[PDB]
Amino acid sequence: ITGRPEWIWLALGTALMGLGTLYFLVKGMGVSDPDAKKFYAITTLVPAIAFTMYLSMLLGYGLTMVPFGGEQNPIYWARYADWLFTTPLLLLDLALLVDADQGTILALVGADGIMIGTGLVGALTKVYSYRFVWWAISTAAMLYILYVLFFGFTSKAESMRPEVASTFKVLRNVTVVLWSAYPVVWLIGSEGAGIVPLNIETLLFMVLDVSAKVGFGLILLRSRAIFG
Amino acid sequence: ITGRPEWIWLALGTALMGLGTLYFLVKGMGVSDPDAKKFYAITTLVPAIAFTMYLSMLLGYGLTMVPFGGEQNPIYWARYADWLFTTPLLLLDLALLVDADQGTILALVGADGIMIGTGLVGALTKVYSYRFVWWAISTAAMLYILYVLFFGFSMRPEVASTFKVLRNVTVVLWSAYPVVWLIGSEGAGIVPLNIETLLFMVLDVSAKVGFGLILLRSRAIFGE
Amino acid sequence: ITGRPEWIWLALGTALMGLGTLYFLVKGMGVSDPDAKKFYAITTLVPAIAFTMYLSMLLGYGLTMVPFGGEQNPIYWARYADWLFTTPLLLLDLALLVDADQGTILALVGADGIMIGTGLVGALTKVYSYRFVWWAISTAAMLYILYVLFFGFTSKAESMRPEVASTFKVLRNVTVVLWSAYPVVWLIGSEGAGIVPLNIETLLFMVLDVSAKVGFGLILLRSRAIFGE
Numbered sequence A: 001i002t003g004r005p006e007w008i009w010l011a012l013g014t015a016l017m018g019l020g021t022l023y024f025l026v027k028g029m030g031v032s033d034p035d036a037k038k039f040y041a042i043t044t045l046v047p048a049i050a051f052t053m054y055l056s057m058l059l060g061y062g063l064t065m066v067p068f069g070g071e072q073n074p075i076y077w078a079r080y081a082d083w084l085f086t087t088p089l090l091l092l093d094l095a096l097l098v099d100a101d102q103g104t105i106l107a108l109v110g111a112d113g114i115m116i117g118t119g120l121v122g123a124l125t126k127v128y129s130y131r132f133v134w135w136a137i138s139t140a141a142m143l144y145i146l147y148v149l150f151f152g153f154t155s156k157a158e159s160m161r162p163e164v165a166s167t168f169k170v171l172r173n174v175t176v177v178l179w180s181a182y183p184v185v186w187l188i189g190s191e192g193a194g195i196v197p198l199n200i201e202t203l204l205f206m207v208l209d210v211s212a213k214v215g216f217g218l219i220l221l222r223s224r225a226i227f228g
Numbered sequence B: 001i002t003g004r005p006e007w008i009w010l011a012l013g014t015a016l017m018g019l020g021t022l023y024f025l026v027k028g029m030g031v032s033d034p035d036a037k038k039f040y041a042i043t044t045l046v047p048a049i050a051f052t053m054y055l056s057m058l059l060g061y062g063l064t065m066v067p068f069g070g071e072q073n074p075i076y077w078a079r080y081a082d083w084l085f086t087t088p089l090l091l092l093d094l095a096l097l098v099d100a101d102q103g104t105i106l107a108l109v110g111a112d113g114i115m116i117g118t119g120l121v122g123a124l125t126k127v128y129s130y131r132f133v134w135w136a137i138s139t140a141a142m143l144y145i146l147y148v149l150f151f152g153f154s155m156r157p158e159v160a161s162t163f164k165v166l167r168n169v170t171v172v173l174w175s176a177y178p179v180v181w182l183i184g185s186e187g188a189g190i191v192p193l194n195i196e197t198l199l200f201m202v203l204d205v206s207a208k209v210g211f212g213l214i215l216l217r218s219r220a221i222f223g224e
Numbered sequence C: 001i002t003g004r005p006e007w008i009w010l011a012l013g014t015a016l017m018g019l020g021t022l023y024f025l026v027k028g029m030g031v032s033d034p035d036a037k038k039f040y041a042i043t044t045l046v047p048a049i050a051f052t053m054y055l056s057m058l059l060g061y062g063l064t065m066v067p068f069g070g071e072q073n074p075i076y077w078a079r080y081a082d083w084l085f086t087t088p089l090l091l092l093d094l095a096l097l098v099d100a101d102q103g104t105i106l107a108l109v110g111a112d113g114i115m116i117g118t119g120l121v122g123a124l125t126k127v128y129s130y131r132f133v134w135w136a137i138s139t140a141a142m143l144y145i146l147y148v149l150f151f152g153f154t155s156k157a158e159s160m161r162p163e164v165a166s167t168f169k170v171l172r173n174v175t176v177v178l179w180s181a182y183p184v185v186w187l188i189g190s191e192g193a194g195i196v197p198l199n200i201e202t203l204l205f206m207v208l209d210v211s212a213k214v215g216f217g218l219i220l221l222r223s224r225a226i227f228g229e
Helices: A007-027 A034-058 A078-097 A102-123 A128-151 A154-158 A162-188 A198-221 B007-027 B034-059 B078-097 B102-124 B128-151 B157-183 B193-216 C007-028 C034-059 C078-097 C102-124 C128-158 C162-188 C198-222
Strands: A063-068 A071-076 B063-068 B071-076 C063-068 C071-076
Touching: A007 A034, A007 A198, A034 A078, A034 A198, A034 C102, A034 C128, A078 A102, A078 A162, A078 A198, A102 A128, A102 B034, A128 A154, A128 A162, A128 B034, A154 A162, A162 A198, B007 B034, B007 B193, B034 B078, B034 B193, B063 B102, B078 B102, B078 B157, B078 B193, B102 B128, B102 C034, B128 B157, B128 C034, B157 B193, C007 C034, C007 C198, C034 C078, C034 C198, C063 C102, C078 C102, C078 C128, C078 C162, C078 C198, C102 C128, C128 C162, C162 C198
Parallel strands: none
Antiparallel strands: A063 A071, B063 B071, C063 C071
């Protein structure tokens, strides 16, 4: 397990997601309000799933080798299995906060599925050039998501009660800033250009993941915005 | 890319699904009615997902080789990844149009999953004879879905007329899929892969973009 | 098809899930109550999905080989593809009976996904010791589910009409008993310690599966509890 330099970040990630899950689990005990139960369920599931995928990477299961650019490249595919479930859950937290229309929720979840799915195909693609075609489609989907979060129902948040509008705006900002970093890290890291070593890329995703999951959840579950 | 003769149909499919997606995206802008939003979201996602899977097939990612009949057979598995998501969305469009009960929506989506899932298992199965067992199970699931669309469902006249048209389009186009599979490279191998690819492309664009044009052009999508 | 000794149990499972599916399909015909329609849809899909996965195992498609402990180990991965969909559906039946809040349903479905997903990872893991780490995580998720069924639903079912309360308690007990057996069979079977041969393990899972699906469904769909109003 300790052979590759990035093991320490995978271990740390596993530990932080695990601790985060247990905290949210305990914190959610006794909560009887139906709306709050939804938020605790969603928000506890996110780092619980991430925990399993961090462990998969730590133990070697979530790592494969993909040929491109004339070499065999180490790819952690477990990330996508994590994000496939956790990113729409995070979007669901936001959508519930502002009471979004079901059509808008479906649009977000589907666009997010496309984003992660094309990211995965890009990550596993054996023809170097095509990798970035997938990256571009995935980024278009992300920009669509960010557009909806800002110009999609941001008006609905404003016309909610102050505690909701306020918590939403904070979490929206966190989301846009943190999520926007992912395509950059992918682009300069091992999946893409190979400018940053895998060790550092893994550290970067770990810091992003923990912030976007546990950080995000702390802010959300600490707020009275979750109560109906 | 140009190495496989079917590339031209995969390229055309990619372009038409993409163009269709962009059109539905723009057309859906500034739509505020909750029900209409639902239909636009569903109907826009359909060719968006199909666009990605056509591109996957065009670029070679969504192609594999399955041994059966003593040979190595080219199988585009990407189709099932597409249909797994897009066919239930299309059924959802129809179900919402008639305000179907949740139990019925679950039955349709579930049967559809079984249809595509067994289709995929058949497509990847290495014993030639068994491939057709899976085809028969999948076809039974399709027949169940068709039965429900005709017998398993009192609505305003715009809704009733758009539904009937979309249902008939669906029943006719979907029924062609099992035939194309049976005679094509996945089944008997009577029709060569480049022609089969052309056939699925015409069917897919009609069942997705054509279907969507009829639906999103109708007043049926707006909630009284 | 008869080349592996467990074939007979896979054939029997296929037939029992198939028959159960056809019986539930026919029984559900003409049911117009919206609530009952949900229960029939859920409950019929369960054995229908199980039927396809039993057939996949029977035909050899849902079998792979995984090296660990100095052997090539036969692993039926099709079980996880089955359980991934059928276990959440079974949980859904229970949740609807007691009119569970959405948040509780999502918690159950999410925990169930983790249970099956980590079970699958454990099943395919080539480092022998790590297989049991996954098993333990999966078992933790199962225990969480069982906790919810007892300290979330049993409380919400008691405050319901008597037919419902009664049918739920039976189905809850059937579920807790049967589901608890799965991690044990896995642990001592081919996926784990290898104390019980594969043919016997397949018999065990078949009896459990048929009871947990068709048995469960027979108890549920016979009850008046599936009707609303």
